[PDB]
Amino acid sequence: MRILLATDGSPQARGAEALAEWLAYKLSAPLTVLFVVDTRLELERALALRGEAVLERVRQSALAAGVAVEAVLEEGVPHEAILRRARAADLLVLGRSDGFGGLGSTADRVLRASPVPVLLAPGEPVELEGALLGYDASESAVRALHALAPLARALGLGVRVVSVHEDPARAEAWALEAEAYLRDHGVEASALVLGGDAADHLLRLQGPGDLLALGAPVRRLVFGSTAERVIRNAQGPVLTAR
Amino acid sequence: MRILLATDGSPQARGAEALAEWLAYKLSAPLTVLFVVDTRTELERALALRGEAVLERVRQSALAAGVAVEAVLEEGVPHEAILRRARAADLLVLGRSGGGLGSTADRVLRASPVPVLLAPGEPVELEGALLGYDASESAVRALHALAPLARALGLGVRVVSVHEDPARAEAWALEAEAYLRDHGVEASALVLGGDAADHLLRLQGPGDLLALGAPVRSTAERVIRNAQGPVLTAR
């Protein structure tokens, strides 16, 4: 399992960088760190001088942590490079820093065409104590379900499945289908059947210590969707898939 | 990893039944066999009876082969059931036809949430494997789906990239090649020009697993429609 960390050196990305090194550490997986000198913005040597620095900073912080790491410097449009590099990965980790969920234009573009799940980390690091899954049995929820299972299993996290619908019978079938799958993959889980507003529940249910997984399909990558409000207001790490 | 085998019983499914049971035994993965009485008083008891004969038949084989197995009898439309049950699986296995893409298989492979393995009618153990790769989203999906299967079956993977511009084909082949080696699979790229479809079809021996990305709607169709060996599709 190969992890890809895309960081822009900023302080807001410190969380993502930290969460990637920890994940690589736990999962015992190799880690690739990518800095993309935004050529768009001579003085370029300045934007490029820092990138190398940001890399060595992150690179050795991991080398020390005992994580197989490789640093990669590149120049050009960030999301373009991030998306290309993602094909050689299984999990993509980004630092939060109006675009989707206020993640900015770059992170916004990545989420729109990433070949793999995308982990959105909060600014301030933290310890993963649990996990949850927003599930409605839609294609992107299924991918989120499948992406979450191995991570939950390896990190020892129980998973609270969260289904929301006007009809409790529909929502119960979804929650159970997903709970069954997680159990069939060695994950401890429960099914929460609720009504009302999905984003409210998910935001209520997730503390800074919880990893929330949810599908984020292109048709719901617009301001106002459930996924959009969750990611924008998420307190802890969010795992998305399409 | 959960493997879902969809078998209609016919001879044109003995290949899927064996491959599925074989993949299960080899990956120590639970197998879920599904039979669907195509409803679409009389025939009822008859069809259902057979379905249970087919299911009970595959079950004993899996057991005798030492594989955690489960059989399910469903009533309704085949693809709708298979696609629904597919949500709880990681890999799906169907027989080519009721000798190519049949009604069901075609609907299924165009909408499955997970990799679809189409097996020929005539059984056979996988000895080799190849991947058609062009760096498209579907191919990346195929690439990622293949790796775990190849390593678990101890199979080398011939990575095939075909384009007019060799520099482009090269970039693709090496990308797919490095991914596999990074995931503990032996692989060597074959960079070509010309027609991808014919090369892939020419290169696949009935004992080879050919992986490629499923069509968005073509290279993929041509290959899936003429494959002489097991095909693995992903979207």
Side-chain angles (χ1 to χ4, degrees), chain A residues 1-2 30 84 86-90 113-116 135 137-139 142-143 145-146 174 177 181 184-185 242, chain B residues 1-2 30 84 86-90 111-114 133 135-137 140-141 143-144 172 175 179 182-183 235:
Chain A
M1 201 264 223
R2 156 80 54 167
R84 175 162 53 70
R87 299 191 305 242
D90 300 301
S114 185
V116 300
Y135 190 70
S138 64
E139 185 167 81
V142 173
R143 293 214 208 308
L145 168 55
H146 296 189
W174 294 336
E177 169 177 288
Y181 176 96
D184 188 47
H185 289 65
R242 324 149 28 211
Chain B
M1 183 197 73
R2 163 73 41 162
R84 174 173 63 253
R87 292 207 294 289
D90 301 301
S112 178
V114 303
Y133 185 79
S136 70
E137 208 176 85
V140 173
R141 287 281 181 301
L143 169 57
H144 296 187
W172 292 341
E175 172 176 282
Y179 177 88
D182 189 47
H183 293 68
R235 39 183 294 277

